[PDB]
Scaffold this active site. Structure first.
Site: not given
Ligand code: NI
Ligand SMILES: [Zn+2]
Ligand SMILES: [Zn+2]
Ligand SMILES: [Zn+2]
Length: 269
Positions: A165, A259
């Site tokens: 990311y 997450y």
């Protein structure tokens, strides 16, 4: 029902976005929309392949980096968990994060220790997976009820690396400054780097700079998950947010995550 001008405008806008993807260094990345007539996602952003640092952020100094010299011929030999100084950060069920296939072993935790530029192994060293980058050709597509998403174009074995990311590394200070600016934003690309000490309080923002993953969607039954891969083993104020497939990904299957930190990894509970 679109008039000539608009229709052409949209045409050109989608082609511009496809141009933009063609310039990404790596496997192909395609754009498709079988749902409506929206050209593509907003173009006001730039694809990057490295974190972009910003004002006030003190990045981990590479000068104080440990470099393993246990590079015989190939990489570092995944059979010598007791030879690498990249692994000295923990000795219990000792082992390299990856197997021979380059996939992330199932006995590997939420932390990956990769070889540095200060190591002696080549870029083929089996402990430099993340560093090598994406390998899967992905496609940005329009989902029906959610915005744009990304699905794979190839079959991916669970444990396969996907991409990190990327984005601007901002201090949790300015983070909130931006939070005061997020208006009717359907998506707020923020990712806190608090895997370790919460003193640094650094965050990754892909609002203006980022990787394909800036298009990944959240879900309850994700097929990919973040792996905190670190190279500067001594200073984890900043590390790589790695996406690996947690389960087999069928071709044309949308990639999704959620997450949970080390609060979903190490526990069967
Ligand atoms: Ni088309
Ligand atoms: Zn080594
Ligand atoms: Zn090393
Ligand atoms: Zn190595």
């Amino acid at each position: 029902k679109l008039d000539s001008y608009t229709h052409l405008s949209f045409y050109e806008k989608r082609e511009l976005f496809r141009k933009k993807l063609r310039e990404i260094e790596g496997p192909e990345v395609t754009l498709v929309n079988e749902v409506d007539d929206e050209p593509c996602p907003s173009l006001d952003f730039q694809f990057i392949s490295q974190y972009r640092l910003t004002q006030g952020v003190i990045p981990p100094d590479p000068n104080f980096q440990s470099g393993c010299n246990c590079s015989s011929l190939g990489g570092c030999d995944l059979n010598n968990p007791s030879r690498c100084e990249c692994l000295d950060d923990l000795d219990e069920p000792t082992h390299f994060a990856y197997d021979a296939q380059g996939r992330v072993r199932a006995d590997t935790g939420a932390v990956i220790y990769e070889c540095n530029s200060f190591c002696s192994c080549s870029m083929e060293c089996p402990n430099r997976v993340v560093q090598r980058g994406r390998t899967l050709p992905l496609e940005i597509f329009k989902t029906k009820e959610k915005g744009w998403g990304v699905r794979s174009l190839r079959f991916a074995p669970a444990g396969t690396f996907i991409t990190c990311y990327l984005g601007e590394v901002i201090t949790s200070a300015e983070a909130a400054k931006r939070d005061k600016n997020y208006d009717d934003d359907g998506i707020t690309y923020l990712f806190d780097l608090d895997m370790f000490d919460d003193a640094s309080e650094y965050t990754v923002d892909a609002q203006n700079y980022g990787d394909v993953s800036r298009f990944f969607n959240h879900s309850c039954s994700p097929n990919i998950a973040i792996y905190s891969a670190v190279r500067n083993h001594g200073f984890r104020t900043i590390y790589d947010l790695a996406f690996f497939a947690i389960k087999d990904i069928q071709p044309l299957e949308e990639l999704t995550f959620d997450y949970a930190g080390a609060k979903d990894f190490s526990p069967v509970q």
